[PDB]
């Protein structure tokens, strides 16, 4: 038992999150981590090093923006921890990661280590009551309401097609190339 499931849609370029049952995702921001490049000289400067979200977007000139996830695969887990931790901050959710089960979108054909270490991150540092990793095409077809059909997506780092038949996403027909938006 918990409060409400939090649907955190990842993405190599734009993370999107909010509570389940919501109509539109209320919290969406780029999936990058910006830390300053210049030298802190004057006091009263922008305190704190790592910036994520609207503040990192605003003072874009100072940062040295990098991406922790590329081609749907996490390259740095520390930046991802800070991003997820930012999702649970006072600027986005204002909640705790102990009373919310987590729905987590994830791209197909990814390494097992993504699900494994991502699960460790949630259930250990966040200690969420329940985690559920899923595909992305299945969710898109559920969003349109129909049930059988292929799904052609191209996010920021991946692109794939999944022929879904009544929910059973056929695992032997998921072509996937790594040429996307970014």
């Amino acid at each position: 038992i918990a409060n409400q499931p939090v649907v955190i849609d990842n993405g190599s370029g734009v993370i999107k999150a909010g509570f389940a049952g919501d109509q539109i995702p209320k919290y969406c921001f780029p999936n990058y981590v910006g830390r300053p490049k210049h030298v802190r000289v004057m006091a009263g400067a922008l305190e704190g090093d790592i910036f994520i979200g609207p503040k990192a977007e605003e003072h874009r000139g100072l940062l040295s923006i990098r991406y922790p996830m590329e081609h749907g695969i996490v390259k740095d887990w520390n930046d991802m921890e800070r991003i997820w931790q930012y999702v649970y901050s006072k600027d986005q959710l204002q909640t705790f990661s102990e009373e919310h089960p987590v729905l987590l979108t994830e791209a197909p054909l990814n390494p097992r280590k993504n699900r494994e270490r991502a699960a460790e991150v949630f259930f250990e540092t966040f200690n969420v009551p329940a985690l559920f990793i899923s595909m992305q095409a299945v969710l898109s077809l559920y969003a349109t309401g129909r049930t059988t059909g292929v799904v052609l997506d191209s996010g920021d780092g991946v692109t794939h097609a999944v022929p879904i038949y009544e929910g059973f996403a056929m695992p032997h027909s998921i072509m996937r190339i790594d040429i996307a938006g970014r």
Partner: protein
């Protein structure tokens, strides 16, 4: 740091001048108080009181011993123990040791432990000197909210102690701001609408706290709905009364469920498109199935003829009583009675049968009568035993056809019952 440990003089004078005002209708120090103060044991109790830093209390009892009309003598001890014919008293020091060059009374916490029973004694002192005092102190402003609740439920626990509730009845707390909103509507007489919060309805932290409260409510309901104990634990009347308590208690849980304030919270979660807590409020809570099983056993538990067995000292009264109770119990064919539950029930019935027969043999003086009266009593004993055997076989056949009409399985049901009456029969 105290270099002036108070002399016994000022304390004895404080006792003689103040203590009789509480132990009489004003009055003065009686001669028994002076002899009771000059008791070597009492002097060393008050000296250990004024010298030992860990000693805080002491008992100044008002013993009223009879036929001397009653005498008035005083008992002094550091240990505090309740008396039934005495006005005891308690002296607590604010300091570890008293510095008598200030008011010694202002370094004593005189608490009156009169002859009123400790249950209502603590209830009186809490409800009239702790709850308004400490709660006013938190009104002027943490461990304190927990302390506050422990004050309330501790004193209420004394009531639970007295009346023997046996079932926890826990209320469902709602968020305070919602209570202020309903209070604002209560000042007018308007029904507090769902959209009274307006923008506050479709917000994240608001619905978050709402689900937190409803989730704790579900745990409060499940705390007592799934509760169960050993069917043979305690006497027969205890288990039977326990099922009765569960019936009325689950109805009280339904009462707390059907209030419009709780429904208002449910409307908040429904209007905010959060179906989880709403559907789980009735499905995740086992209250519905608990109430339906309660209602299945509800007529079976009301009007139980165990009192026919209570004041039955004559074996003929026991014969007719045993047949009556079992014929009333015959309605378990339509209410699905369990096997092992019925067998432990039967052994509980035999437990009370044995208890009644034990006192019956006590009030019989059977070791001195002639064989004529003893023969009649003997035959009456076997009369009761035969009513047990043949009617119990009728109840056996009754449960046999019950298990046949239900068609469930082939369990290893034990009918090798060794009740509480064959022990005396042999």
């Amino acid at each position: 740091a105290v270099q002036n440990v108070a002399d016994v003089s000022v304390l004895q004078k404080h006792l003689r001048k103040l203590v009789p005002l509480l132990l009489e209708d004003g009055g003065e120090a009686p001669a028994a108080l002076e002899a009771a103060l000059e008791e070597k044991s009492a002097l060393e109790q008050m000296r250990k009181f004024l010298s030992d830093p860990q000693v805080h209390t002491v008992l100044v009892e008002r013993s009223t011993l009879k036929e001397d009309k009653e005498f008035i003598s005083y008992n002094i001890n550091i240990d505090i123990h309740y008396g039934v014919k005495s006005n005891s008293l308690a002296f607590i020091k604010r300091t570890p040791v008293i510095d008598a060059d200030k008011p010694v009374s202002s370094q004593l916490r005189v608490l009156t432990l009169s002859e009123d029973s400790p249950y209502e004694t603590l209830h009186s002192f809490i409800s009239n000197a702790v709850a308004p005092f400490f709660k006013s102190y938190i009104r002027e402003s943490k461990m304190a909210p927990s302390v506050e609740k422990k004050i309330a439920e501790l004193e209420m626990g004394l009531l639970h102690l007295q009346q023997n509730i046996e079932i926890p009845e826990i209320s469902l707390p709602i968020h305070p701001m919602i209570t202020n909103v309903a209070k604002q509507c209560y000042e007018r007489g308007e029904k507090p609408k769902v959209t009274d919060f307006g923008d506050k309805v479709e917000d994240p932290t608001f619905l978050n706290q709402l689900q937190s409260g409803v989730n704790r409510w579900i745990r409060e309901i499940q705390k007592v709905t799934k509760l169960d104990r050993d069917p043979a634990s305690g006497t027969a009347l205890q288990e039977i009364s326990f099922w009765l308590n569960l019936e009325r208690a689950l109805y009280r849980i339904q009462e707390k469920r059907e209030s419009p304030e709780v429904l208002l919270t449910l409307d908040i979660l429904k209007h905010g498109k959060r179906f989880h807590a709403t559907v789980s409020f009735d499905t995740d809570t086992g209250l519905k199935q608990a109430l339906e099983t309660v209602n299945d056993y509800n007529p079976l538990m009301k009007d139980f003829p165990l009192n026919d067995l209570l004041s039955a000292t004559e074996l003929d009264k026991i014969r007719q009583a045993l047949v009556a109770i079992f014929t009333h119990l015959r309605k378990i064919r339509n209410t699905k009675y369990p096997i092992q539950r019925a067998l432990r029930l039967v052994e509980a019935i035999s437990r009370d049968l044995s208890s009644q027969l034990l006192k019956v043999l006590g009030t019989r003086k059977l070791m001195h009568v002639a064989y004529e009266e003893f023969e009649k009593v003997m035959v009456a004993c076997f009369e009761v035993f035969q009513t047990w055997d043949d009617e119990y076989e009728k109840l056996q056949v009754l449960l046999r056809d019950i298990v046949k009409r239900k068609r469930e399985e082939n369990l290893k049901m034990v009918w090798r019952i060794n009740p509480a009456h064959r022990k005396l029969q042999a």
